[PDB]
Amino acid sequence: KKVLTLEGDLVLGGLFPVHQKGGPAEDCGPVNEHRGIQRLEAMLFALDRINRDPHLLPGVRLGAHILDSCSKDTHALEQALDFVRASTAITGVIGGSYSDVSIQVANLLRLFQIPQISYASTSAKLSDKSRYDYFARTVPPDFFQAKAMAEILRFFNWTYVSTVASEGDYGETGIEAFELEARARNICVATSEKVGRAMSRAAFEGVVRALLQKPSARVAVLFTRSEDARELLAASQRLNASFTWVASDGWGALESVVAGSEGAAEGAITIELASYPISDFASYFQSLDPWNNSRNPWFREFWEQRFRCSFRQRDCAAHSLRAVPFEQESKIMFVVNAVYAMAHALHNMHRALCPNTTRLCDAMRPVNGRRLYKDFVLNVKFDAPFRPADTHNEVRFDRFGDGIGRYNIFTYLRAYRYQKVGYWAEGLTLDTSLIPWASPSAGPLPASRCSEPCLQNEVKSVQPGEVCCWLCIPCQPYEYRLDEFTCADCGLGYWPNASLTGCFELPQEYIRWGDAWAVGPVTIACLGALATLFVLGVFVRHNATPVVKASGRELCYILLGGVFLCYCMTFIFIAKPSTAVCTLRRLGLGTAFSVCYSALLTKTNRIARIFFISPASQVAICLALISGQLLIVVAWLVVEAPGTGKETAPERREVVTLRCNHRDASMLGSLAYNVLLIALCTLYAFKTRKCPENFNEAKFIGFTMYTTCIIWLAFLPIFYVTSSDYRVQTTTMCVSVSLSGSVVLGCLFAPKLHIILFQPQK
Amino acid sequence: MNSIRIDGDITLGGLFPVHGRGSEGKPCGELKKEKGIHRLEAMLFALDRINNDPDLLPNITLGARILDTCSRDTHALEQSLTFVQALPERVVGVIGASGSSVSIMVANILRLFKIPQISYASTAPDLSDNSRYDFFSRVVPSDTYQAQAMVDIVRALKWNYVSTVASEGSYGESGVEAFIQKSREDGGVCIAQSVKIPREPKAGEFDKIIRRLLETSNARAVIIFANEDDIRRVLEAARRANQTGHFFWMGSDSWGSKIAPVLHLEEVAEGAVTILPKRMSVRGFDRYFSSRTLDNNRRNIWFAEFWEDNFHCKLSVKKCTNRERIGQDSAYEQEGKVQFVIDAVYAMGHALHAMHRDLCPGRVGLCPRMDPVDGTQLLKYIRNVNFSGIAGNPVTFNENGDAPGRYDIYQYQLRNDSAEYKVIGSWTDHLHLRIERMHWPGSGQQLPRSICSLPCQPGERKKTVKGMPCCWHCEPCTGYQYQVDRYTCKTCPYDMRPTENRTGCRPIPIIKLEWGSPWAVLPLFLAVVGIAATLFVVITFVRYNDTPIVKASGRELSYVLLAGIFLCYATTFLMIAEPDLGTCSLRRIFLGLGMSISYAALLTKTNRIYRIFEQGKRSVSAPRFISPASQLAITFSLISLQLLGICVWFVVDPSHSVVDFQDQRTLDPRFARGVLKCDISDLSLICLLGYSMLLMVTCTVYAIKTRGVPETFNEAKPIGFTMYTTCIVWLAFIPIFFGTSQSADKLYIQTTTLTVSVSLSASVSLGMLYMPKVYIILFHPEQ
Numbered sequence A: 001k002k003v004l005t006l007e008g009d010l011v012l013g014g015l016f017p018v019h020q021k022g023g024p025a026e027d028c029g030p031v032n033e034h035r036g037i038q039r040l041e042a043m044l045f046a047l048d049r050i051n052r053d054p055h056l057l058p059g060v061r062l063g064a065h066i067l068d069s070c071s072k073d074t075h076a077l078e079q080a081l082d083f084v085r086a087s088t089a090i091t092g093v094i095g096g097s098y099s100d101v102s103i104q105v106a107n108l109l110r111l112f113q114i115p116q117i118s119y120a121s122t123s124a125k126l127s128d129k130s131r132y133d134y135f136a137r138t139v140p141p142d143f144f145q146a147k148a149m150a151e152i153l154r155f156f157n158w159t160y161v162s163t164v165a166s167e168g169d170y171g172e173t174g175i176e177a178f179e180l181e182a183r184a185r186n187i188c189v190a191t192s193e194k195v196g197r198a199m200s201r202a203a204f205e206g207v208v209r210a211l212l213q214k215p216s217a218r219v220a221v222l223f224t225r226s227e228d229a230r231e232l233l234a235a236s237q238r239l240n241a242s243f244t245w246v247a248s249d250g251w252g253a254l255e256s257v258v259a260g261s262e263g264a265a266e267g268a269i270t271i272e273l274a275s276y277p278i279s280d281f282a283s284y285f286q287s288l289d290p291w292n293n294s295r296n297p298w299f300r301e302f303w304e305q306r307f308r309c310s311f312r313q314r315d316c317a318a319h320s321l322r323a324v325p326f327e328q329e330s331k332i333m334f335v336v337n338a339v340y341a342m343a344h345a346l347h348n349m350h351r352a353l354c355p356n357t358t359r360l361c362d363a364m365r366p367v368n369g370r371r372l373y374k375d376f377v378l379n380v381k382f383d384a385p386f387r388p389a390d391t392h393n394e395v396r397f398d399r400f401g402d403g404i405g406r407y408n409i410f411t412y413l414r415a416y417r418y419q420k421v422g423y424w425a426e427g428l429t430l431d432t433s434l435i436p437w438a439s440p441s442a443g444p445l446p447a448s449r450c451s452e453p454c455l456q457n458e459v460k461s462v463q464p465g466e467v468c469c470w471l472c473i474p475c476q477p478y479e480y481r482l483d484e485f486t487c488a489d490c491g492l493g494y495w496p497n498a499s500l501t502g503c504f505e506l507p508q509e510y511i512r513w514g515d516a517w518a519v520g521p522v523t524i525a526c527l528g529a530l531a532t533l534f535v536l537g538v539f540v541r542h543n544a545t546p547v548v549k550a551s552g553r554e555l556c557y558i559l560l561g562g563v564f565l566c567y568c569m570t571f572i573f574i575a576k577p578s579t580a581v582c583t584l585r586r587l588g589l590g591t592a593f594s595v596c597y598s599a600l601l602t603k604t605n606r607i608a609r610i611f612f613i614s615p616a617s618q619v620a621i622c623l624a625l626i627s628g629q630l631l632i633v634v635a636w637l638v639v640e641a642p643g644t645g646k647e648t649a650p651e652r653r654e655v656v657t658l659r660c661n662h663r664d665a666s667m668l669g670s671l672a673y674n675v676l677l678i679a680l681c682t683l684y685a686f687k688t689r690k691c692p693e694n695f696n697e698a699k700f701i702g703f704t705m706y707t708t709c710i711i712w713l714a715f716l717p718i719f720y721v722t723s724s725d726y727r728v729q730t731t732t733m734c735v736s737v738s739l740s741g742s743v744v745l746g747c748l749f750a751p752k753l754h755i756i757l758f759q760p761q762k
Numbered sequence B: 001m002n003s004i005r006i007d008g009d010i011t012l013g014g015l016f017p018v019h020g021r022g023s024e025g026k027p028c029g030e031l032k033k034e035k036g037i038h039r040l041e042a043m044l045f046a047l048d049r050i051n052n053d054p055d056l057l058p059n060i061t062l063g064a065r066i067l068d069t070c071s072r073d074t075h076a077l078e079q080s081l082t083f084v085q086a087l088p089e090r091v092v093g094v095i096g097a098s099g100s101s102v103s104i105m106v107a108n109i110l111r112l113f114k115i116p117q118i119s120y121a122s123t124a125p126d127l128s129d130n131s132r133y134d135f136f137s138r139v140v141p142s143d144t145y146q147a148q149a150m151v152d153i154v155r156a157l158k159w160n161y162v163s164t165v166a167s168e169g170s171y172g173e174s175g176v177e178a179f180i181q182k183s184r185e186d187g188g189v190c191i192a193q194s195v196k197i198p199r200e201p202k203a204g205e206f207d208k209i210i211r212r213l214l215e216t217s218n219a220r221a222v223i224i225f226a227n228e229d230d231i232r233r234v235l236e237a238a239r240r241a242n243q244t245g246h247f248f249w250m251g252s253d254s255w256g257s258k259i260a261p262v263l264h265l266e267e268v269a270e271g272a273v274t275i276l277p278k279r280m281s282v283r284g285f286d287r288y289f290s291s292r293t294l295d296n297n298r299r300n301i302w303f304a305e306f307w308e309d310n311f312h313c314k315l316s317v318k319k320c321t322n323r324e325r326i327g328q329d330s331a332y333e334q335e336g337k338v339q340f341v342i343d344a345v346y347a348m349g350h351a352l353h354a355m356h357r358d359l360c361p362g363r364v365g366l367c368p369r370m371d372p373v374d375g376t377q378l379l380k381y382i383r384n385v386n387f388s389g390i391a392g393n394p395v396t397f398n399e400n401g402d403a404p405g406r407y408d409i410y411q412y413q414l415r416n417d418s419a420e421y422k423v424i425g426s427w428t429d430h431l432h433l434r435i436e437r438m439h440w441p442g443s444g445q446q447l448p449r450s451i452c453s454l455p456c457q458p459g460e461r462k463k464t465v466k467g468m469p470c471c472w473h474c475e476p477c478t479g480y481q482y483q484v485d486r487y488t489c490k491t492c493p494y495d496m497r498p499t500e501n502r503t504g505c506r507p508i509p510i511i512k513l514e515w516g517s518p519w520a521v522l523p524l525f526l527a528v529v530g531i532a533a534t535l536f537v538v539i540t541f542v543r544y545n546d547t548p549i550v551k552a553s554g555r556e557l558s559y560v561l562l563a564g565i566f567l568c569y570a571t572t573f574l575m576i577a578e579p580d581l582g583t584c585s586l587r588r589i590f591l592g593l594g595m596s597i598s599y600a601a602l603l604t605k606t607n608r609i610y611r612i613f614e615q616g617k618r619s620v621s622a623p624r625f626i627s628p629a630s631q632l633a634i635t636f637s638l639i640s641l642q643l644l645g646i647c648v649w650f651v652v653d654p655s656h657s658v659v660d661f662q663d664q665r666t667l668d669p670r671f672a673r674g675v676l677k678c679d680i681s682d683l684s685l686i687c688l689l690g691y692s693m694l695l696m697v698t699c700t701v702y703a704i705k706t707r708g709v710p711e712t713f714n715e716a717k718p719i720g721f722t723m724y725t726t727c728i729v730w731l732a733f734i735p736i737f738f739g740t741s742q743s744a745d746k747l748y749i750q751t752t753t754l755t756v757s758v759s760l761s762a763s764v765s766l767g768m769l770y771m772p773k774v775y776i777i778l779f780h781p782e783q
């Protein structure tokens, strides 16, 4: 319909969203003021400023040929042809509006490599110069906003969150970057939604209902949609909906999506490119007279959309754009940079081709955009127009033609307005005292986090949630963690290593095994034998009774046969288990036969006979009984073997222990019916005392029998269970053996010992 | 003004290099008769047919706007825009853009508006990339189809170790990379090496190429993707290197069937296999085209120029009569690509005929949907065409817009020395080769093979060469191993020895102690003499059982001693007999037992003599156990404990026969033997000697005391010597039985020394204690 055209000593055309997207018909929508017309008008002033500048190509009136994109890529593609139809031949496109217009146009222009510099397309798609080898930008890649977004989420510990992006590259490059940046900070995206370029009002509510499916994710991220500034108004609904919106630079300090759409709750965060207002561009725009501004062929229609008195009516344009409040659109600084940058590259192209003259030849003005891009555009050095001394804004390009990756962070506040609360520049800084979520005064801080972060002893459990949402549950004390989703384990003897990456074979219980307890009680048992000995070593010299050389020597030898057998075996012991020890220590608990009864059976048969009698008869009888006792218990190893040199309580696994247990009640079957007749014999023998010897020893034998039976029996009420537990087993066995045997001995030996020891003359 | 417009409802776009490049600022040169105007007319030829054809676009006129590239990308591109300036005619979709260098620009511009392109000539893979040229299609195959054919052929020839050689530049590099990757993907072929020919080769580099190809000299196959001169120079290098008949060449269409690269190298190139594009001429076009005179094709604004160059004449060099006819007054032949110009035009025609039946079903003219006739829809309809083309050959496109591969396969052969390329077969995405009709200079009709290595014999391993599955190291199997797999063999635990091919194992021969051998004869003889000597002795004691001289000896003890001597001899030879229960019931038990009894009875007699003096340490009474019955009781007590030790040991070590391969074991089982013996442990010697040697020590404690003992006891002298003697035998024994344990020979030494020791203890007692008195007993029973 209408196009803006100027004469120029060079022509550097442009393209803007002067109109917004219209309906399904092949027409345009209402004027965009902020992102449309203000940007366009800035370019016109920037041209006047460069034309008047006494240093920048002063010998030339630069002109422009400016197109309305109407936010339809087909329209923009057809209109953009004016730049190549001459092949007027136009020396480089400034702007191209938003991304898919700039991209389908940086796509369109490739056929002739026509240069292009943008102020508002941000997608990383155009960073790949194998497809777009001429195209430069004044704005940073969009994946820096994805970093900012992920970082802001990480700040509020917001580990789990929802997002909305569009079809068209702003969506796919934005969302893919943000997802990677989310993953890199352990942030579980709860869900992500894709919106088209022509989505209905019902579908806008449909997206909100999708975002309301887990109200536990309070945060909803917005990637410009097609253009949030118009489209978010349809989604920020008050129809029982709210979120904490986090938007890309498609929304930034704009009334255009909150007035009448209170779903844009206080605390919504918008990320915009860092910029400064300029009073000289604002002055130009606000001072425009609708009657005199013939240069802009839409300004009078924009006036009718901003003011109700149409230029077709009478007494109109009494008001002014300075008379009524307005705000400068945030990207104006980038627009004027793109204007100057195109001019600078062409100033150096002009000097390079023709330094002695005012203007390019018509054979030169087919400036190859790749030639211009790599040698002239990327090497432009010029301070941003009207920049304050407190900034660093410039038209300087990066190696891919990228702009400056610095953003402002605004918060939407009631008394409604926006305020800057912080910024991002490869790192997040916030002054949270300006955000409604600091020091909350109306309930807790906003929730957007799925589980606690797990401890190193716990495994991912309970909660897939939406996704990635795992709680963790501790492993048991005996379990380790080869997977953070599941606890590992090992057999008995095996217990978690501190790393939780494996098991240790446990130690022994050990106490007094290596330093074997056995030697003490053994030595104490040997004291019986030695006390006996030094007494026998002097006896006839101090208590006469010379039958001690025969009868006394053999009677003591009979007992110590026993004592020995006994202590020798139980002290084969739990030191160094399995081995020489395991076969011959327990043998069904048959050591009380070693002492008390070896002693008593034989001293009995001996006296019975006395009341074949010989020293040899005494030796021979006790040995026959010992061999009988010994053989039938050891003969259970015709069936069995040493073993069970490893166990522990599952209810412990604190140590291994090595307890032999070879069908013990079956081994007791070696003797199980017979020892009660040994007890009865004992009771009879107790009775038979008809010839009391010197010192009335028959009475001391009867006394022995009574108390010994007891002391011995007394151990089994202790042993039967507690033999399973080290300290009690060891202490009680050691003293039991020592003691019981000592009773047998004390009972008959003490008279001879104490008589000689305290009265050697007796 | 410099273009052709054919009016129509639907306007087809099109492009030809009707000129070459001009110079000094002029875009357009001479007329490319064949590549340009011949193809251009083939477009209009197919276009007329489409409009005439009742099956495609019924009563809808396919107009066209047709354009002249001048073989310049800027000129081709600047005129191509006119289709979009018309978005004037509706240019719906486009043919051609000729070769690759121009087709990239038309593919660049027309995708910008979602307008499709069908090239008849551009082949380069750089247009198969849908991220940049999504709207592109071609009705000709790309170069990468030769690579698949090459891989298929190398496999067809059963080659697996080849060298790949190519020029620098996309032609060479594309063929090679497609070849290598496709070779890897199909498998069966490994590449010995990959060598490039520089864009600017150095002198002698080609000889260096040959030398490098000879670093892997069994890689007789060479695959070439290089130009005519590069081919010639490789062949010259092979000639200079005298590798004629060693190397065999395979290669691309750059060689084709041209005799040019093999001139004066005919003997070098013979057997070479090349891949040629498959094509046919369109007869209908020639019949049409050959009839066109100036007045029969006035719609073609370049036809006049065509005439001036075709006939070398001027229309305003000779003045032209305006009557000359091509093919008669000037030579004429059809350009092979005419085939694809016609199929490109038809493929568009067919795709338009798909939008017609879907979006304007059965109408005449264009429906409202066909006012935009959205090229985004035409694009799918092109890719989905499947029809017989002008050659009868199906026209399809893959997902990148590439047509299926169609090539002929030729071999360079010398027929009576003639430099000819013969057809072996063809490839239509698959081989059809008459391999038996192929010739190779180093083999005639026999197929040479370019392979890694040679097969292993059974018992030898093919160990994979790391990185090249086709290749192996042949590693023979050894030791006591046998084949498991083609690259594996393993050991047989053994008593089994590998077979001669080491693919299996078989049993090791077993030896017993046979009565002809030195180790069987000695104790066999001794056992027999034993009994004969023993009975001489026993017989005098039995026949004179009640005479004074027998009684005086302690007849009762003499009986037990003599009986034990006899009894042990009776079975001595059996302990080394072939093992069975009749011997494993005796083991060292029975013989050991008689020996032990002999010692105990000698000890009993010894105690009867020496007890009167030793008893003095414990008692001053008369020697205990004097009555002969009581002396026998001792004889019996001393030995009944041996029987108990025996009873226990019998249970512990069971009575069975065993074969132990270990006793004659070797590292190489083919030299191994095993041994058949009763399964008797070394512990059996403790069970025996642990006590019988103590009877001995006791006896010798007494015998040494003889010096103080009265003469009526001189019978002690030979008991003493006997026990000293047999002590020496058992002292001699341990160094033989155990002192030899390091040697395999123990299998006879141990068994022999034992059976012999039995005879010795037995023989010595007779020789010292009884025989000196037997002479006397036999002739003087009263002494």
Ligand SMILES: N[C@@]1(C(=O)O)CO[C@H]2[C@H](C(=O)O)[C@H]21
Pocket: A021, A071, A072, A097, A098, A099, A100, A101, A166, A167, A168, A170, A196, A197, A198, A225, A226, A227
């Ligand atoms: N993203 C757009 C923009 O404003 O830059 C370009 O397409 C119109 C696109 C859309 O809705 O799909 C808006």
